[PDB]
Amino acid sequence: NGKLFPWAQIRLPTAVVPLRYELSLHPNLTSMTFRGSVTISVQALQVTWNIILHSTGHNISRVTFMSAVSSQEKQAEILEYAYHGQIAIVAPEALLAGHNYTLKIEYSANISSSYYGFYGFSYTDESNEKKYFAATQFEPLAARSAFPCFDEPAFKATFIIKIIRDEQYTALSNMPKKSSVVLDDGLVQDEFSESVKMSTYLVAFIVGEMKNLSQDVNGTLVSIYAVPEKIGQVHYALETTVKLLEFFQNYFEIQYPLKKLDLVAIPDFEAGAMENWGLLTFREETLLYDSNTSSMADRKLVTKIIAHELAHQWFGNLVTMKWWNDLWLNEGFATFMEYFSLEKIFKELSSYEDFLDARFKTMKKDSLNSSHPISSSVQSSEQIEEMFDSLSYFKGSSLLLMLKTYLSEDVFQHAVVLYLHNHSYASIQSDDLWDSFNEVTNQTLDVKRMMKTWTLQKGFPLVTVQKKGKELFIQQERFFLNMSYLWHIPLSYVTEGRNYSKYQSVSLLDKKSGVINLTEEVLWVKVNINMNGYYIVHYADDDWEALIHQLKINPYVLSDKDRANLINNIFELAGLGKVPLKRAFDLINYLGNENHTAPITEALFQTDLIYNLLEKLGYMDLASRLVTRVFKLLQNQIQQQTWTDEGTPSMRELRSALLEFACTHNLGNCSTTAMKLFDDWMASNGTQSLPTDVMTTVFKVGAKTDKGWSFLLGKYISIGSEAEKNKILEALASSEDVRKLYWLMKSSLNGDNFRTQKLSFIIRTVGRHFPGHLLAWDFVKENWNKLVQKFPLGSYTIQNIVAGSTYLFSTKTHLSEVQAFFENQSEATFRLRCVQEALEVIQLNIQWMEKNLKSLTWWLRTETSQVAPA
Ligand SMILES: *[C@@H]1O[C@H](CO)[C@@H](O[C@@H]2O[C@H](CO)[C@@H](O[C@@H]3O[C@H](CO[C@H]4O[C@H](CO)[C@@H](O)[C@H](O)[C@@H]4O)[C@@H](O)[C@H](O[C@H]4O[C@H](CO)[C@@H](O)[C@H](O)[C@@H]4O)[C@@H]3O)[C@H](O)[C@H]2NC(C)=O)[C@H](O)[C@H]1NC(C)=O
Ligand SMILES: *[C@@H]1O[C@H](CO)[C@@H](O[C@@H]2O[C@H](CO)[C@@H](O[C@@H]3O[C@H](CO[C@H]4O[C@H](CO)[C@@H](O)[C@H](O)[C@@H]4O)[C@@H](O)[C@H](O[C@H]4O[C@H](CO)[C@@H](O)[C@H](O)[C@@H]4O)[C@@H]3O)[C@H](O)[C@H]2NC(C)=O)[C@H](O)[C@H]1NC(C)=O
Ligand SMILES: *[C@@H]1O[C@H](CO)[C@@H](O[C@@H]2O[C@H](CO)[C@@H](O[C@@H]3O[C@H](CO)[C@@H](O)[C@H](O[C@H]4O[C@H](CO)[C@@H](O)[C@H](O)[C@@H]4O)[C@@H]3O)[C@H](O)[C@H]2NC(C)=O)[C@H](O)[C@H]1NC(C)=O
Ligand SMILES: NC(=O)[C@H](Cc1ccccc1)NC(=O)[C@H](CC(c1ccccc1)c1ccccc1)CP(=O)(O)[C@@H](N)CCc1ccccc1
Ligand SMILES: *[C@@H]1O[C@H](CO)[C@@H](O[C@@H]2O[C@H](CO)[C@@H](O[C@@H]3O[C@H](CO)[C@@H](O)[C@H](O)[C@@H]3O)[C@H](O)[C@H]2NC(C)=O)[C@H](O)[C@H]1NC(C)=O
Ligand SMILES: *[C@@H]1O[C@H](CO)[C@@H](O[C@@H]2O[C@H](CO)[C@@H](O[C@@H]3O[C@H](CO)[C@@H](O)[C@H](O)[C@@H]3O)[C@H](O)[C@H]2NC(C)=O)[C@H](O)[C@H]1NC(C)=O
Ligand SMILES: *[C@@H]1O[C@H](CO)[C@@H](O[C@@H]2O[C@H](CO)[C@@H](O[C@@H]3O[C@H](CO)[C@@H](O)[C@H](O)[C@@H]3O)[C@H](O)[C@H]2NC(C)=O)[C@H](O)[C@H]1NC(C)=O
Ligand SMILES: *[C@@H]1O[C@H](CO)[C@@H](O[C@@H]2O[C@H](CO)[C@@H](O)[C@H](O)[C@H]2NC(C)=O)[C@H](O)[C@H]1NC(C)=O
Ligand SMILES: *[C@@H]1O[C@H](CO)[C@@H](O[C@@H]2O[C@H](CO)[C@@H](O)[C@H](O)[C@H]2NC(C)=O)[C@H](O)[C@H]1NC(C)=O
Ligand SMILES: *[C@@H]1O[C@H](CO)[C@@H](O[C@@H]2O[C@H](CO)[C@@H](O)[C@H](O)[C@H]2NC(C)=O)[C@H](O)[C@H]1NC(C)=O
Ligand SMILES: *[C@@H]1O[C@H](CO)[C@@H](O[C@@H]2O[C@H](CO)[C@@H](O)[C@H](O)[C@H]2NC(C)=O)[C@H](O)[C@H]1NC(C)=O
Ligand SMILES: *[C@@H]1O[C@H](CO)[C@@H](O)[C@H](O)[C@H]1NC(C)=O
Numbered sequence: 001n002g003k004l005f006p007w008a009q010i011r012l013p014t015a016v017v018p019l020r021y022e023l024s025l026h027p028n029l030t031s032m033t034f035r036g037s038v039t040i041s042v043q044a045l046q047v048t049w050n051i052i053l054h055s056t057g058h059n060i061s062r063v064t065f066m067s068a069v070s071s072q073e074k075q076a077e078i079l080e081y082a083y084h085g086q087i088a089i090v091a092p093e094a095l096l097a098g099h100n101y102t103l104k105i106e107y108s109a110n111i112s113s114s115y116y117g118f119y120g121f122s123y124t125d126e127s128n129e130k131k132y133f134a135a136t137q138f139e140p141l142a143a144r145s146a147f148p149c150f151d152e153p154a155f156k157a158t159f160i161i162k163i164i165r166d167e168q169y170t171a172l173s174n175m176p177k178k179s180s181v182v183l184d185d186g187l188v189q190d191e192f193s194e195s196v197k198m199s200t201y202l203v204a205f206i207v208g209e210m211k212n213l214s215q216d217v218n219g220t221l222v223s224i225y226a227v228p229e230k231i232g233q234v235h236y237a238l239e240t241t242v243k244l245l246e247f248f249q250n251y252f253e254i255q256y257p258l259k260k261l262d263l264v265a266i267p268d269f270e271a272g273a274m275e276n277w278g279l280l281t282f283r284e285e286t287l288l289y290d291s292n293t294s295s296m297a298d299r300k301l302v303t304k305i306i307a308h309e310l311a312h313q314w315f316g317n318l319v320t321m322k323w324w325n326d327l328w329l330n331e332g333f334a335t336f337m338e339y340f341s342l343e344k345i346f347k348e349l350s351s352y353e354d355f356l357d358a359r360f361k362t363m364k365k366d367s368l369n370s371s372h373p374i375s376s377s378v379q380s381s382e383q384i385e386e387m388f389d390s391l392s393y394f395k396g397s398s399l400l401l402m403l404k405t406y407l408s409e410d411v412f413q414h415a416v417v418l419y420l421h422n423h424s425y426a427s428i429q430s431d432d433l434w435d436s437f438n439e440v441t442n443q444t445l446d447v448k449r450m451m452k453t454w455t456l457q458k459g460f461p462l463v464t465v466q467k468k469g470k471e472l473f474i475q476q477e478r479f480f481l482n483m484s485y486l487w488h489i490p491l492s493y494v495t496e497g498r499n500y501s502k503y504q505s506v507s508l509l510d511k512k513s514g515v516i517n518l519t520e521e522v523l524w525v526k527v528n529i530n531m532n533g534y535y536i537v538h539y540a541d542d543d544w545e546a547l548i549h550q551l552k553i554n555p556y557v558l559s560d561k562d563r564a565n566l567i568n569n570i571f572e573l574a575g576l577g578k579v580p581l582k583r584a585f586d587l588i589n590y591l592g593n594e595n596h597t598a599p600i601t602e603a604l605f606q607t608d609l610i611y612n613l614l615e616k617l618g619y620m621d622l623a624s625r626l627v628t629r630v631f632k633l634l635q636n637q638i639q640q641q642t643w644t645d646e647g648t649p650s651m652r653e654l655r656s657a658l659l660e661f662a663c664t665h666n667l668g669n670c671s672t673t674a675m676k677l678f679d680d681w682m683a684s685n686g687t688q689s690l691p692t693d694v695m696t697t698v699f700k701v702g703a704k705t706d707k708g709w710s711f712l713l714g715k716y717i718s719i720g721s722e723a724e725k726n727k728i729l730e731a732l733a734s735s736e737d738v739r740k741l742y743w744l745m746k747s748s749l750n751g752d753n754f755r756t757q758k759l760s761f762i763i764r765t766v767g768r769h770f771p772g773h774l775l776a777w778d779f780v781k782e783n784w785n786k787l788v789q790k791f792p793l794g795s796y797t798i799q800n801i802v803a804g805s806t807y808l809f810s811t812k813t814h815l816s817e818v819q820a821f822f823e824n825q826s827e828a829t830f831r832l833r834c835v836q837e838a839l840e841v842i843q844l845n846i847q848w849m850e851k852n853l854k855s856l857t858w859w860l861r862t863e864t865s866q867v868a869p870a
């Protein structure tokens with residue numbers, strides 16, 4: 001490319017840093033263009049002739065350069081290097097160390113039609129009037145497409161934003177609006193206060209018609225914004241935000257430093273949310289809430305995501321990673337605080353179940369060979385994007401969970417408060433976090449050397465346990481399936497002596513192996529309590545047998561988390577090969593006596609995975625026998641379920657999980673009950689309320705008919721609750737009619753009836769069942785370039801689409817097909833982690849069948865199929 005561009009690396013030089021930006025913009029939402037002026041106050045730290053900077057998609061009309069002393073307005077030369085998104089201003093005289101200069105760039109651009117950058121869209125009223133909207137989504141690398149800037153997290157500065165807007169529209173930004181000035185035509189010029197020192201990826205602005213619901217919290221004005229038709233649905237978000245804000249301010253011991261806090265429901269938005277200082281943005285479906293149209297799950301989603309964005313105000317905004325290799329310092333911490341804060345002041349939501357489920361999934365991902373270390377180098381935009389995955393979020397927060405469990409809660413909070421004070425308005429890398437722990441630790445434990453392997457090595461240990469009399473023999477090794485270094489592991493363990501008293505302790509495995517002294521003789525022992533540790537445990541056969549026998553005798557000597565753990569671990573170990581798959585089904589035979597959600601949903605997960613693998617291979621009979629077996633196992637919990645909203649949140653989640661399992665596979669007469677409810681709902685023009693906990697199920701069953709499908713579509717394009725629309729959309733995309741499934745995907749990719757923000761979800765849903773299995777993948781291939789135009793390589797959305805439409809493939813023939821497809825895209829695309837993980841998941845699918853197919857075929861030989869065999 002550009003050997004004639006005065007910079008080669010992807011990280012900007014350190015020679016010049018920005019102090020202040022004054023950015024004034026004139027967006028035209030109608031024509032979808034904008035004109036701009038950016039003034040950048042910089043300082044040189046070394047002698048240099050070049051200012052290297054970021055800019056993309058900018059038609060640059062004038063570039064002036066002012067020596068601060070000299071105050072005369074020069075012209076300066078400009079070079080471009082599109083590959084790295086970089087531009088270079090070559091200076092008339094050399095920049096001297098410690099001198100100040102002002103850089104002014106005038107330019108015009110397009111308002112983006114993706115979800116990335118400064119983007120804009122139109123939506124439709126209840127009034128059937130067309131409305132326009134513009135919003136920013138900059139993280140990680142899009143700020144540079146709205147304005148020239150030093151677009152790297154470590155270059156923090158202050159921003160003065162100016163927006164020209166039509167009088168009817170409201171403009172928002174990070175800071176409070178300082179003033180307005182009326183302009184010719186129906187135009188207003190807005191000016192926002194100078195911001196605090198922050199990263200460019202956090203700059204945000206919004207132009208559109210909105211209303212607000214507000215409340216004072218001790219000098220901070222908290223406001224929820226939404227389009228006027230929706231403003232009735234923001235009361236729960238406001239009440240929640242106020243609670244979590246007080247909580248976080250008490251815990252961190254550092255006040256939120258802005259005079260305003262805005263939370264905005266954006267009509268069209270790809271992420272779940274974004275933490276821009278003072279102007280947090282959300283999908284409508286993740287911030288709006290109505291008790292009568294939104295399920296329990298929907299309420300949890302809104303509480304969780306608000307906790308998450310609020311936590312970012314400290315971890316991410318106040319304190320920020322130096323570079324994307326340490327993204328987990330943001331996202332791990334924010335995820336940890338999300339689930340921590342809910343357990344403190346929303347304990348009734350049982351959000352710990354979600355945390356637990358997400359970790360199960362992150363481990364399966366982490367166990368692959370195409371995993372990276374959680375802190376790993378990123379040297380391209382694709383790798384930067386790829387950091388936004390479940391490792392950085394859920395492994396990062398489970399590292400912290402391990403650490404908090406092992407030290408104390410108070411020792412943890414002390415470390416945290418030191419950390420945020422010491423690095424306020426500044427940048428960090430992994431070592432600073434361990435340093436802050438070391439200061440509180442009293443060098444009793446060297447936390448830096450304890451966390452070394454956890455942060456720099458991929459994967460996690462398999463811990464093997466064998467009871468030799470009154471002592472546990474213990475080993476660690478890399479967990480992975482084939483086709484290094486030691487962890488410092490906090491081994492917790494709980495146990496029951498011969499006299500039925502329970503003892504629990506903690507030791508720390510530093511070496512390859514160790515012995516634990518048990519003090520007594522024990523009936524059973526369970527390692528890794530509540531899965532507070534990020535590893536999997538394998539027992540010797542005698543010791544598996546003891547836990548499996550105790551579950552059959554009285555499962556409640558362990559927690560629901562403990563029993564969920566065991567179910568997960570034994571299935572992942574039967575997949576590797578360390579135990580026969582039969583052993584896993586022995587362990588879940590106790591489920592007839594299980595009343596907690598977490599172990600039941602974890603078993604329902606493994607069952608469905610296996611079911612869906614067999615179904616796509618065409619082993620229909622065998623797959624029906626499998627869910628019949630599991631159905632008989634849970635027959636009593638399933639049959640005692642009511643079709644209501646009664647019970648604790650957790651019990652409400654169990655109802656949904658159980659009824660959904662029975663209706664999907666046509667077991668019992670749940671289908672009949674659901675259809676009766678749908679017909680009565682449909683014949684009442686959606687008036688006779690459906691209990692929010694059974695809607696998805698009822699809608700799925702109705703959508704299996706033309707008459708019902710059409711009627712649901714009619715509701716989707718017209719009702720005002722985005723929560724209900726989402727349950728409807730899931731039903732539509734569960735139709736067995738291929739023409740309809742094709743229409744849903746094509747419509748969403750174009751906008752039209754469904755927004756493109758629903759596309760990954762629609763494709764996910766279509767690819768999961770048999771009629772749409774081949775259709776989703778084909779859709780992804782044929783529209784591959786249009787997808788990448790809307791969602792760059794290799795962002796979260798694309799990795800979601802690739803994974804969700806390939807992970808149920810289990811033959812060599814599909815493996816070759818998927819591989820060949822990506823190799824014809826480009827060698828760069830085929831070498832993406834996204835692609836490599838998909839190829840690896842398929843290979844594992846293939847090995848899984850060749851190990852367990854004949855086993856499963858034998859175990860189920862007497863069970864009754866539901867389908868006729870071919
Ligand atoms: C099955 O159930 C669905 C509900 O899902 C019903 O759909 C509703 O149908 C009604 C009646 O057609 C719709 O009401 C109409 O809304 C329009 C938009 O209203 C907005 O804009 C006005 C000003 O523009 C605001 O005042 C208002 O508060 C909203 O912000 C109105 O413009 C329409 O008004 C015109 O017609 C009525 C006569 O019906 C006159 O009184 C008015 O003065 C004016 O002439 C009208 O009010 C409503 O939008 C639909 N809701 C949804 C969610 O789609 C179906 O009607 C129902 N089917 C059957 C057979 O009953
Ligand atoms: C309701 O609202 C009020 C105001 O918003 C809150 O009261 C404020 O509490 C904060 C934090 O506790 C105070 O800000 C801090 O004051 C501490 C001391 O500053 C005083 O003392 C110094 C000592 O030199 C005096 O010179 C000075 O005049 C101040 O009056 C500081 O130690 C604080 O810590 C640090 O500042 C930043 C904050 O993170 C760090 O980077 C530094 O390391 C430094 O240590 C901070 O400056 C504030 O002054 C209080 N206001 C009032 C009016 O008392 C309530 O806490 C709040 N209640 C809620 C939210 O529940
Ligand atoms: C971007 O460029 C577009 C043109 O490509 C330009 O579009 C026009 O914007 C104005 C916005 O002010 C619109 O004018 C309105 O017209 C309606 C009638 O359709 C009026 O009701 C509007 O409101 C009031 O006018 C005064 C207050 O503004 C009041 O005295 C009066 O009582 C009304 O309440 C307003 O006059 C016009 O419709 C559009 N045209 C198109 C084709 O979209 C837009 O202004 C440019 N934006 C920027 C920021 O440069
Ligand atoms: N949900 C999303 O699409 C993205 C991407 C993602 C998805 C899964 C795992 C990791 C990351 N995440 C976000 O929007 C989370 C919330 C989400 C979530 C929280 C924890 C773990 C996983 C997801 C969420 C969703 C529902 C309820 C509560 C929180 C919001 P954020 O503030 O992190 C923001 N920094 C993401 C910016 C971004 C997103 C995707 C691509 C590029 C840039
Ligand atoms: C280059 O420009 C930067 C700012 O763009 C200069 O740094 C800062 O300059 C201001 C002076 O205006 C210092 O702020 C303070 O003023 C307020 C009164 O409002 C008071 O609170 C402070 O005690 C200080 O007087 C600021 O601290 C300063 N920062 C640094 C690191 O120096 C910088 O001086 C300029 N360099 C030049 C012109 O060589
Ligand atoms: C605020 O955080 C800074 C980091 O910006 C802390 O400075 C760091 O202090 C730790 C000690 O706790 C240093 O660790 C030591 O480094 C030496 C140098 O190689 C090493 O040989 C030792 O074994 C030990 O690990 C760390 O290097 C240092 N880092 C930097 C960048 O200075 C500082 O302690 C914190 N301040 C407060 C008041 O807590
Ligand atoms: C789910 O099912 C389990 C087992 O059916 C329930 O655990 C049972 O809980 C009751 C009361 O919570 C226990 O009875 C009590 O035992 C303690 C200790 O001996 C004593 O202090 C009380 O006076 C009473 O006797 C019972 O032992 C326990 N069963 C087992 C096997 O541990 C659990 O409550 C159910 N959960 C829900 C949400 O329904
Ligand atoms: C980039 O924008 C510039 C102006 O900002 C466009 O150049 C011309 O503008 C002058 C007046 O400033 C007119 O004399 C010309 O008519 C404009 N150009 C044309 C082709 O009409 C320039 O065209 C834009 N560049 C690109 C590549 O679109
Ligand atoms: C919407 O926001 C405004 C502030 O932006 C809220 O009320 C304001 O209160 C302050 C102080 O009393 C005043 O500076 C503003 O003039 C007030 N605005 C209005 C419109 O009254 C207002 O309450 C918020 N709306 C809702 C429904 O909460
Ligand atoms: C059950 O037996 C255990 C040991 O076999 C008893 O626990 C020990 O009690 C002694 C004192 O009697 C303590 O010094 C030990 O520390 C205890 N062991 C542990 C592991 O804590 C226990 O008291 C007995 N309980 C009953 C109800 O019989
Ligand atoms: C059709 O399904 C419903 C499930 O809701 C059956 O009603 C329940 O039946 C089981 C088993 O007899 C009981 O344990 C439940 O308590 C019943 N009612 C509830 C939970 O409300 C119904 O009996 C089924 N149809 C037939 C013919 O048996
Ligand atoms: C905006 O998009 C149009 C589409 O063809 C293009 O011609 C124009 O040059 C673009 N402006 C930019 C990239 O600044």
Ligand SMILES: *[C@@H]1O[C@H](CO)[C@@H](O)[C@H](O)[C@H]1NC(C)=O
Nearest residue numbers: 232233235289290291292293
């Ligand atoms: C939802 O329903 C309950 C009772 O059915 C009611 O008290 C509540 O007000 C309803 N929610 C709204 C927003 O009306």
Ligand SMILES: *[C@@H]1O[C@H](CO)[C@@H](O)[C@H](O)[C@H]1NC(C)=O
Nearest residue numbers: 369370371372458481482483
């Ligand atoms: C696993 O990936 C590493 C790079 O992390 C690579 O060197 C190695 O060849 C791969 N091994 C297998 C078995 O896939």
Ligand SMILES: *[C@@H]1O[C@H](CO)[C@@H](O)[C@H](O)[C@H]1NC(C)=O
Nearest residue numbers: 470471515516517518519520
């Ligand atoms: C284990 O601990 C018990 C009591 O705590 C002690 O009597 C016993 O000797 C210990 N075993 C070993 C091998 O140290």
Ligand SMILES: [Br-]
Nearest residue numbers: 024025026036
């Ligand atoms: Br301007």
Ligand SMILES: [Br-]
Nearest residue numbers: 125127128129
């Ligand atoms: Br109107």
Ligand SMILES: [Br-]
Nearest residue numbers: 116117142145
């Ligand atoms: Br972009």
Ligand SMILES: [Br-]
Nearest residue numbers: 339340343401
């Ligand atoms: Br927690």
Ligand SMILES: [Br-]
Nearest residue numbers: 325376377378
């Ligand atoms: Br790096």
Ligand SMILES: [Br-]
Nearest residue numbers: 010084380381
């Ligand atoms: Br880059």
Ligand SMILES: [Br-]
Nearest residue numbers: 405406490492
């Ligand atoms: Br522990």
Ligand SMILES: [Br-]
Nearest residue numbers: 639668669670
């Ligand atoms: Br049933």
Ligand SMILES: [Br-]
Nearest residue numbers: 713739740743
């Ligand atoms: Br259609």
Ligand SMILES: [Br-]
Nearest residue numbers: 742743746747
């Ligand atoms: Br068509």
Ligand SMILES: [Br-]
Nearest residue numbers: 575844845848
């Ligand atoms: Br599998």
Ligand SMILES: [Br-]
Nearest residue numbers: 858859860862
């Ligand atoms: Br048998």
Ligand SMILES: [Br-]
Nearest residue numbers: 620621869870
């Ligand atoms: Br078959």
